[PDB]
Design a protein around this ligand. Structure first.
Ligand SMILES: Cn1ccnc1C(NC[C@H]1O[C@@H](n2ccc(=O)[nH]c2=O)C[C@@H]1O)c1ccccc1
Ligand SMILES: Cn1ccnc1[C@@H](NC[C@H]1O[C@@H](n2ccc(=O)[nH]c2=O)C[C@@H]1O)c1ccccc1
Ligand SMILES: Cn1ccnc1[C@H](NC[C@H]1O[C@@H](n2ccc(=O)[nH]c2=O)C[C@@H]1O)c1ccccc1
Lengths: 149, 150, 137
């Protein structure tokens, strides 16, 4: 699966210019942030992303198409008090919004995520190796980050 | 992937006639229910379902088959204190029971769910788009809601 | 999909020798006390690879190793244990022991017993699973 990732700030772009014939693509925490104790915080991952797979035959009742994909916790999240609220995120084929990780802080202390933490990863519904590239837009629409003005 | 869904009551049938390219199919909470604080409740979704996909050759040591499939939380469950106790439910190809969501109320107060809330969704193992239709039975067994009599 | 499982001990091998569906259950292999309000890395005492047919995938001889998944069993929900990382992703390249990160959410300790089945191995496609017990991967 191949992902096109639009970084929403330059600080993020520099993180991903760094960065793997692997199943998951790790995502960065892009900004130091405090998570209140006993809370769910919607943590903005500062990127938009489209995933491409070869067209496939599926039952329902241009070799390369958009596809839905998954936001998984990284196994090393287990070591912390944070847990993904929604278990596993399902990003649909369309999707053009900022990817959000919803993290439950299960402790009663506040928790500091730091820039460059990796808590979550994108994963293909097929488990296949992921490749990505930075692009400036996903498509022509404003939500795509493309088009005029 | 195509879901044949059997609604277990008339009330549920109407909710599914009225239903709003997509990878998950939202399921309704079908009955106002109070969930106790700090507990796990097995919330009956009032439906049974099977999933149909193209037959595949798979390594294991008409072209439409029954397939196993996935029960995911909707991401809007995040706003609530309700968490899905088994993370992602696996429903096997053969399963003819009512679909249950096991919801942990992590809050220390009672949580009230309403008829028409949508907290969970069915999703295909391959993430392809889903269609569904409402049917009177899944198969000929009683558990499947079908066959002769009562 | 098909799994090659190396049992890490004499005693574990037994449990799998005396064990086609969508997930393969894994045993709790030794009695253990889980502390209250805690996360424990519970060792399952197996190594495993998974084999599926090669596929064309977009990216920029019959068989290959694929990634597979570690799901909780639906029955885990009767316990106060939760899988910390929701669903475990075991990569194609992984040769180490399989661990289940379990959160004990109880304010009391919780004892797991050998022959408990709390988690299960599932394939990316939901296809029926099979395994054999080898000596090495
Ligand atoms: C938080 N928030 C504020 C406005 N919209 C939202 C959300 N919308 C879900 C979309 O986000 C995408 N989405 C889905 C799952 C996920 O884990 N991360 C996502 O970005 C595809 C889903 O379609 C939202 C996002 C994450 C957790 C909860 C809720
Ligand atoms: C709690 N309870 C009381 C009577 N039945 C149940 C349970 N049903 C397990 C089966 O239901 C199906 N099942 C599996 C996972 C799931 O998330 N939802 C389900 O309906 C397939 C599984 O085969 C049960 C249900 C949900 C979670 C845990 C346990
Ligand atoms: C516990 N521990 C000590 C040294 N390394 C670890 C761990 N490392 C992750 C590897 O284990 C494999 N792994 C991944 C996810 C999972 O649920 N179970 C696993 O066994 C493949 C992953 O690559 C570890 C294991 C489990 C949860 C968190 C962390």
């Amino acid at each position: 699966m191949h992902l096109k990732i639009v970084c929403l700030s330059d600080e993020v772009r520099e993180m991903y210019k760094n960065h793997e014939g692997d199943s998951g693509l790790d995502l960065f925490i892009v900004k130091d942030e405090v998570l209140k104790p006993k809370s769910t915080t919607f943590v903005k991952l500062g990127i938009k992303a489209i995933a491409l797979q070869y067209k496939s035959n599926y039952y329902y009742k241009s070799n390369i198409v958009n596809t839905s994909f998954l936001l998984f916790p990284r196994s090393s999240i287990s070591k912390t008090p944070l847990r993904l609220a929604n278990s596993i995120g399902l990003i649909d084929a369309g999707y053009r919004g900022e990817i959000i990780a919803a993290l439950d802080n299960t402790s009663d202390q506040e928790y500091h995520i730091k820039k460059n933490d990796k808590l979550v990863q994108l994963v293909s519904f097929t488990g296949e190796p992921l490749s990505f590239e930075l692009v400036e837009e996903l498509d022509e629409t404003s939500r795509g980050e493309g088009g005029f003005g």
